[PDB]
């Protein structure tokens, strides 16, 4: 509803196509946050 840019368009097309299902990704504010912490001299990451 706020931030998943690829996810909110999919949500709209799923509500329209009769399928009340979400495919949530990472909120874009968190990517803004990881890019703003990395613009300080700090290496923040996502591990797997």
Partner 1 sequence: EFDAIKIALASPDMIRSWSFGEVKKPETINYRTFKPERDGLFCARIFGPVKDYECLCGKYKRLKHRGVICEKCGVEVTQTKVRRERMGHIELASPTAHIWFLKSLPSRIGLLLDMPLRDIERVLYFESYVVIEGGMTNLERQQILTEEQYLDALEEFGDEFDAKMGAEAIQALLKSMDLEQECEQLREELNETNSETKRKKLTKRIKLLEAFVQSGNKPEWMILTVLPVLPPDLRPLVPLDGGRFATSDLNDLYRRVINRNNRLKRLLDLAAPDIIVRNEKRMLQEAVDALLDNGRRGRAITGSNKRPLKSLADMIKGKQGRFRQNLLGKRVDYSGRSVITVGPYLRLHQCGLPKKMALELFKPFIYGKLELRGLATTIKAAKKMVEREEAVVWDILDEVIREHPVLLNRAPTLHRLGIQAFEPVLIEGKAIQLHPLVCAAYNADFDGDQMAVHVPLTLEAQLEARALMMSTNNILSPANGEPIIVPSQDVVLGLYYMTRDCVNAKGEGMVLTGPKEAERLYRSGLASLHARVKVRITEYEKDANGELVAKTSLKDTTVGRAILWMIVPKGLPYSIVNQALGKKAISKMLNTCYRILGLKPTVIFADQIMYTGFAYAARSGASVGIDDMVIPEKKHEIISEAEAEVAEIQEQFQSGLVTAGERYNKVIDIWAAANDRVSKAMMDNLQTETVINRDGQEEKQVSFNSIYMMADSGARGSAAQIRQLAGMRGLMAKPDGSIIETPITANFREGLNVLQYFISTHGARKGLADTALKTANSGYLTRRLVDVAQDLVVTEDDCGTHEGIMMTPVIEGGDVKEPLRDRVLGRVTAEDVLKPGTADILVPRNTLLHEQWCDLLEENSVDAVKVRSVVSCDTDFGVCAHCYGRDLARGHIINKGEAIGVIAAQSIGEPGTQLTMSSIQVKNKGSIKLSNVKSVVNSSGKLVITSRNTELKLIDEFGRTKESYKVPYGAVLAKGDGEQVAGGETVANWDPHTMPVITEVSGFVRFTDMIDGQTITRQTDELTGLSSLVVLDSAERTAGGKDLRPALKIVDAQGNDVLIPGTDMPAQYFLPGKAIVQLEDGVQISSGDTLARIPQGGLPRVADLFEARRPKEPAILAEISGIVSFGKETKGKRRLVITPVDGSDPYEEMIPKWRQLNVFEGERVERGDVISDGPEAPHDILRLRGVHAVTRYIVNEVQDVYRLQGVKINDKHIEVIVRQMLRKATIVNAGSSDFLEGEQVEYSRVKIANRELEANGKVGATYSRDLLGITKASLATESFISAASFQETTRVLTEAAVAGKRDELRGLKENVIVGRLIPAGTGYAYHQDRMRRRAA
Partner 2 sequence: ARVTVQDAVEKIGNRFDLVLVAARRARQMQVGGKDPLVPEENDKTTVIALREIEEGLINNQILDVRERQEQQEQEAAEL
Alpha carbon distance 26, 40 (integer Å): 22
Q: Choose, by CB under 8 A, the member of 1, 2, 16, 18 that binds partner 2.
A: 18
- Give me the least distance between CB of 18 and partner 2, in Å please: 7
Angle at 16 between CA 30 and CA 1, to 5 degrees: 20
Q: Choose, by CB under 8 A, the member of 6, 19, 29, 31 that binds partner 2.
A: 19
Q: Which residues bind partner 1 (CB under 8 A)?
A: 1-4, 8, 11-12, 15-18, 20-22, 24-33, 35-48
* Residues ≥6 apart with Cβ < 8 Å to 23: 7, 10, 11
List interacting residues with partner 2 (CB under 8 A). Answer: 18-21
């Amino acid at each position: 509803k706020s931030d998943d840019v690829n996810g909110r368009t999919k949500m709209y097309k799923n509500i329209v196509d009769g399928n009340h299902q979400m495919e949530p990704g990472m909120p874009e504010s968190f990517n803004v946050l990881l890019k703003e912490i990395r613009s300080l001299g700090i290496n923040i990451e996502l591990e797997d």
